[PDB]
């Protein structure tokens, strides 16, 4: 995906302020709460009975951290997302068989979490830049379906 320099600047500047220990878990937790069918893939994580249970679940926070790392990895290779996400694509598509619509959903939940954390700093043009990024990541993760 192609970001303008202005968009790259906006994205990179905000990402440096991201709490990398928490934001991934917040996004994954919210995915599980807002789109409850996604819990089908996480039965080994234990207590997912309530929103509080999900958000406070240590396994959700831990896994969320791994997801955010992958997004961070993608932000460093915007011109080669396919190669960057090749192994993850094989995992999520060939092994897990996650419908790729859910890649889009998690990306949009991440955008909601960024808006929550940054408030007025998450301006409409900053959002538009991040929508390009999460769309790129979703498409790259879905490559094994293509």
């Amino acid at each position: 995906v192609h970001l303008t320099p202005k968009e790259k600047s906006a994205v990179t500047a905000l990402w440096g302020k991201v709490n990398v220990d928490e934001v991934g878990g917040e996004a994954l937790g919210r995915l599980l709460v807002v789109y409850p069918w996604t819990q089908r893939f996480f039965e080994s994580f234990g207590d997912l009975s309530t929103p509080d249970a999900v958000m406070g679940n240590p396994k959700v926070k831990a896994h969320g951290k791994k997801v955010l790392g992958a997004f961070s990895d993608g932000l460093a290779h915007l011109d080669n997302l396919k190669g960057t996400f090749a192994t993850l694509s094989e995992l999520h598509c060939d092994k897990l068989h996650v419908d790729p619509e859910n890649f889009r959903l998690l990306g949009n939940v991440l955008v909601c979490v960024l808006a929550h954390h940054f408030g007025k700093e998450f301006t409409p043009p900053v959002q538009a830049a991040y929508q390009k990024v999460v769309a790129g990541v979703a498409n790259a993760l879905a490559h094994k379906y293509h």
Binding site: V33, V34, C112, A115, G119, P124, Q127, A128, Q131
Partner: protein
């Protein structure tokens, strides 16, 4: 279907929007136009630049429709019947676009109401906007 807790959550969150209702609707539209440029083609008679009086005025209309839906949440097909006819028949709005505007409304609420946008309320708001979208796309024929 919207649960009792969902209706309570949506009413509470929307209650916090207040006199910013029109403003937030205008911001959601702007977010949609910038993030998803395909949606811009529905508004050729609009100037879609920042600070546009037309987007401001339209945001208030959108907000007022959502407020009507909140106020009549158990009777939404009836409450939104006229608007359903408009969007489906006259305007022929692609159903995908309601998902895009719904997402931008959630982002707008998250950016302005940090205390209200809990995971549970996020879920309720998403269900509510999906319900509104279902009604507004119910009239293609």
């Amino acid at each position: 279907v919207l649960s009792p807790a969902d209706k309570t959550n949506v009413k509470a969150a929307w209650g916090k929007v207040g006199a910013h209702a029109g403003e937030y609707g205008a911001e959601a539209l702007e977010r949609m136009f910038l993030s998803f440029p395909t949606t811009k083609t529905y508004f050729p008679h609009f100037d879609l630049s920042h600070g546009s009086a037309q987007v401001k005025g339209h945001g208030k209309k959108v907000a007022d429709a959502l407020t009507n839906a909140v106020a009549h949440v158990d009777d939404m097909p009836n409450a939104l019947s006229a608007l359903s006819d408009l969007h489906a028949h006259k305007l022929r709005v692609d159903p995908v676009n309601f998902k895009l505007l719904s997402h931008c409304l959630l982002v707008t609420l998250a950016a302005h109401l940090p205390a209200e946008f809990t995971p549970a309320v996020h879920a309720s708001l998403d269900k509510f906007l999906a319900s509104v979208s279902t009604v507004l796309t119910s009239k293609y024929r």
